[PDB]
PDB file of N, CA and C and ligand atoms in Angstrom:
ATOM      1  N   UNK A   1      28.317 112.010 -33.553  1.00  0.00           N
ATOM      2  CA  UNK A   1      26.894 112.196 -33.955  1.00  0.00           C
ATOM      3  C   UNK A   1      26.717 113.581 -34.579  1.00  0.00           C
ATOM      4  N   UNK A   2      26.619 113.641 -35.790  1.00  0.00           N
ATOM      5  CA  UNK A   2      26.362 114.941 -36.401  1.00  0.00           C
ATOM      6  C   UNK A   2      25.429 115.755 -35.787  1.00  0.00           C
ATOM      7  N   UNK A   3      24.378 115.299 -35.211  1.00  0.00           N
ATOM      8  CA  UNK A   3      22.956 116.199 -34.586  1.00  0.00           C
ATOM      9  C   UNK A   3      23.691 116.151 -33.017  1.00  0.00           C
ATOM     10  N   UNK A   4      23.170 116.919 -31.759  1.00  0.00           N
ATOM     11  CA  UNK A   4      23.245 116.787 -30.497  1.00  0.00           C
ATOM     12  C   UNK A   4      22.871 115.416 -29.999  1.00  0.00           C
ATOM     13  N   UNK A   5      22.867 115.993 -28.986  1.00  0.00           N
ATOM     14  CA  UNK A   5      22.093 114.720 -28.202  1.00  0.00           C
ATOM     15  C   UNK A   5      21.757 114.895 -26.835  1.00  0.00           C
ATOM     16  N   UNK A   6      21.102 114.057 -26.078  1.00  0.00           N
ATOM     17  CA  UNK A   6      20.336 114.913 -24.803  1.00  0.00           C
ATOM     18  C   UNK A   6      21.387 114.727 -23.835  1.00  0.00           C
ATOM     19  N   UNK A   7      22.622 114.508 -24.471  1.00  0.00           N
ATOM     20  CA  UNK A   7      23.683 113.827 -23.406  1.00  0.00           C
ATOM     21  C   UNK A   7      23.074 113.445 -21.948  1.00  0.00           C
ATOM     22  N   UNK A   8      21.961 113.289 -21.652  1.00  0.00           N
ATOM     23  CA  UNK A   8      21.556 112.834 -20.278  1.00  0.00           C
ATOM     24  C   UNK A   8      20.982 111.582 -20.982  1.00  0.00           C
ATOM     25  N   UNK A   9      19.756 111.342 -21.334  1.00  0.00           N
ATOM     26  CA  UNK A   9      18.635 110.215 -21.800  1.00  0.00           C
ATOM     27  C   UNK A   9      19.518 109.384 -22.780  1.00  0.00           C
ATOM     28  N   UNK A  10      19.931 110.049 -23.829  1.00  0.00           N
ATOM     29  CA  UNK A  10      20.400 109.460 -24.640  1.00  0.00           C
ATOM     30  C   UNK A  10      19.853 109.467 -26.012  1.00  0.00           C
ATOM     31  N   UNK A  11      19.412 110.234 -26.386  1.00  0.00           N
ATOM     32  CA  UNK A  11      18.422 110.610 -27.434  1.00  0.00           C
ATOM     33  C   UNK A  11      19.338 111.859 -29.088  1.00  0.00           C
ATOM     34  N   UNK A  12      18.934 112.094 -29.829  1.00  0.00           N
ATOM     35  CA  UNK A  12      19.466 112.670 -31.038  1.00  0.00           C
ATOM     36  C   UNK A  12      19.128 114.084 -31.106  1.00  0.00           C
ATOM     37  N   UNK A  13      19.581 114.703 -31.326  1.00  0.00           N
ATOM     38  CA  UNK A  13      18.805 116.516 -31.902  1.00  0.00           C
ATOM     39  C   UNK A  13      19.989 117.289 -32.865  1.00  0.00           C
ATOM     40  N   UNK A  14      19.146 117.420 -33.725  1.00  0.00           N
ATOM     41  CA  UNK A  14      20.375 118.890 -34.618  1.00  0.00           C
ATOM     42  C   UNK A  14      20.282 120.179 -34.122  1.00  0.00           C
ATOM     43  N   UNK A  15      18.799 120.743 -32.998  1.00  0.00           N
ATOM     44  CA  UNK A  15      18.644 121.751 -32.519  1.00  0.00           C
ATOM     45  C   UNK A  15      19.619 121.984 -30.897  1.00  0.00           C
ATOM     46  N   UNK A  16      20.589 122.235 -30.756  1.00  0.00           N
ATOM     47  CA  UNK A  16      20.941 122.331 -29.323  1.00  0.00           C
ATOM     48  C   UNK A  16      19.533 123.398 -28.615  1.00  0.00           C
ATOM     49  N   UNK A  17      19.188 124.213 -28.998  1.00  0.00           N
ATOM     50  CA  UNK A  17      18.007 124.793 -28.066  1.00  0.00           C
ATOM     51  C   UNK A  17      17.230 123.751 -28.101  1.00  0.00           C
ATOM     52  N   UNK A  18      16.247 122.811 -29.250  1.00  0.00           N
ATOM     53  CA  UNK A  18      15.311 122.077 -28.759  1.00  0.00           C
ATOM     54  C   UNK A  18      16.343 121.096 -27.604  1.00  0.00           C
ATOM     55  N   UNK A  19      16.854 119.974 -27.902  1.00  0.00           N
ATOM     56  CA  UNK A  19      17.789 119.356 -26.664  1.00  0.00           C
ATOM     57  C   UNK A  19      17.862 120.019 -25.227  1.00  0.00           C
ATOM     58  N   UNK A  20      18.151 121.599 -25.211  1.00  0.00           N
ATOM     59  CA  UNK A  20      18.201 122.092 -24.236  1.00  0.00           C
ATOM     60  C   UNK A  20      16.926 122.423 -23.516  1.00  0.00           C
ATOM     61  N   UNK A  21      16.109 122.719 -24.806  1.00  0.00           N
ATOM     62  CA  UNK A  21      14.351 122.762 -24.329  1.00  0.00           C
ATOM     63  C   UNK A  21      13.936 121.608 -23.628  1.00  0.00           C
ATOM     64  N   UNK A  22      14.793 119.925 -24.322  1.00  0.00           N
ATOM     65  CA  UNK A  22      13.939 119.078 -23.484  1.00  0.00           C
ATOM     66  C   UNK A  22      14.963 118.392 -21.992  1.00  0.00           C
ATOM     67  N   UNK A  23      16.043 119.390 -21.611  1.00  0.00           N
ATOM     68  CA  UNK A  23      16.608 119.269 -20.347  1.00  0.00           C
ATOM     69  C   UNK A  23      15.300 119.777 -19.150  1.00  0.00           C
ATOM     70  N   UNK A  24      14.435 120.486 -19.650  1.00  0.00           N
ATOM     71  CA  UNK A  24      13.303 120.823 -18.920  1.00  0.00           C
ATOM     72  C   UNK A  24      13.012 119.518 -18.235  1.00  0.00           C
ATOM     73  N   UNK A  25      13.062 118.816 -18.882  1.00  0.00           N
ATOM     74  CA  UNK A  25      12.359 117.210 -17.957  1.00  0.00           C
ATOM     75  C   UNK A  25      13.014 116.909 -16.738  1.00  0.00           C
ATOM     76  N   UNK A  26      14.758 117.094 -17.097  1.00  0.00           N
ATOM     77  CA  UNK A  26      15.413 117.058 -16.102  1.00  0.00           C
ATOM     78  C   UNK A  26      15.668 117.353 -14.678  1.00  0.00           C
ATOM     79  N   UNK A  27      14.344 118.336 -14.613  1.00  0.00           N
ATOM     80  CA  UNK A  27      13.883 119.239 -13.264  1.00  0.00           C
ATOM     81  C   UNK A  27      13.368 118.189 -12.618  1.00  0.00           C
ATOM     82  N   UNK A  28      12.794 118.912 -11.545  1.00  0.00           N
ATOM     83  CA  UNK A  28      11.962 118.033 -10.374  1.00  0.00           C
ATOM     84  C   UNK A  28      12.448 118.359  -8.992  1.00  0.00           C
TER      85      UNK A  28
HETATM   86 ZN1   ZN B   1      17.198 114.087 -21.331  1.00  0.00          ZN
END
């Protein structure tokens, strides 16, 4: 995959900070 990805959800990103921005969810 040329872009990232949320390697958790399963989702696309070319930003590794945004991706990493949305590991935030991953909390709890
Ligand atoms: Zn995720």
């Amino acid at each position: 995959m040329r872009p990232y990805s949320c390697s958790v959800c399963g989702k696309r990103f070319s930003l590794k900070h945004q991706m990493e921005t949305h590991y935030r969810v991953h909390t709890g």
